[PDB]
Write a protein that binds this ligand. Structure first.
Ligand SMILES: O=C(Nc1ccccn1)Nc1cccc2c1[C@H]1CCCN1C2=O
Length: 276
């Protein structure tokens, strides 16, 4: 817009390109989201008031000249770049455990407001030098990787639980430095989950066979041992991970319950080792 000097493009994806920009008035740097509807305008205002230490703050909404710009606070790194820069040693467990606990606090704040992220992933998870992690790119709702099985099976009325699955997958990625379910299409994605967690059924998931895209012809696979899936996560973590990865949306753990899981009895807030 005619108020922001665009320093550089930092993102793209579905709704729009995002930029590092400085407000010519104040001087402050921010993230400008160029989108691309009364309903959308009204929903966006809901988010303006949605405020929490772990949710990336939405500063201003500029619907002008029939265009939509969203102005957010800026953070220097996303989790994806940080995980890439730590591929060799991996992220320390206390750092991981701190980030999962903050991500859970945010998701627990959003959910009690009936707001879902729906597209959680490393790239829209932002971190600062002060050891804080924040949820970005939401309230708005190309990889299939962190997509919950109910969405892949045609369910239209998603639960907050789709988020918990995505987070679960992210958790397993930080620990193993390797993506859990790196499928490259809706069906390849579905078959990888089936291969690790076994093909679901009426016992493990009552109702699954009456889902839109369920096909009786799905090959039958056995569940693998979580010990082979997420080494070296201790029993407390593997426990929490399996409750976040439950096929049934209804049996999947909520962010509030996960907050009291014994895996966070010893949480702390170490500061990352980032290079900007
Ligand atoms: O603050 C940000 N910094 C940053 C730096 C490098 C890479 C990504 N982000 N980013 C930021 C802030 C608010 C909203 C968004 C973003 C980016 C991340 C991906 C999609 N984007 C958004 O929708």
């Amino acid at each position: 817009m005619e108020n922001f000097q665009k320093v550089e493009k930092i993102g793209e994806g579905t709704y729009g390109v995002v930029y590092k920009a400085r407000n010519k008035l104040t001087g402050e740097v921010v993230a400008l989201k160029k989108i691309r509807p009364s309903t959308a305008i009204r929903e966006i205002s809901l988010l303006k008031e949605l405020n929490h230490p772990n949710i990336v703050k939405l500063l201003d909404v500029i619907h002008t000249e029939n265009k939509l710009y969203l102005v957010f606070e800026f953070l220097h790194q996303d989790l994806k770049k940080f995980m890439d820069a730590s591929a060799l040693t991996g992220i320390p467990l206390p750092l991981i455990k701190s980030y999962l606990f903050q991500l859970l606090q945010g998701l627990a704040f959003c959910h009690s407001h009936r707001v879902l992220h729906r597209d959680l992933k490393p790239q829209n998870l932002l971190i600062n030098t002060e050891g804080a992690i924040k949820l970005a790119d939401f309230g708005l709702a190309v990889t299939l990787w962190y997509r919950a099985p109910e969405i892949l099976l045609g369910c239209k009325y998603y639960s907050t639980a789709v988020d918990i699955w995505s987070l679960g997958c992210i958790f397993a990625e930080m620990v193993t430095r390797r993506a859990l379910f790196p499928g490259d299409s809706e069906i390849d994605q579905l078959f990888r989950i089936f291969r690790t967690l076994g093909t679901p059924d009426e016992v493990v998931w009552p109702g699954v066979t009456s889902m839109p895209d369920y096909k009786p012809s799905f090959p039958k696979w056995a569940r693998q041992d979580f010990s082979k899936v997420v080494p070296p996560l201790d029993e407390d973590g593997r426990s929490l991970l399996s409750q976040m990865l439950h096929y049934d949306p209804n049996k999947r753990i909520s962010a509030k319950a996960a907050l009291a899981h014994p895996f966070f009895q010893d949480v702390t807030k170490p500061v990352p080792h980032l290079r900007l």
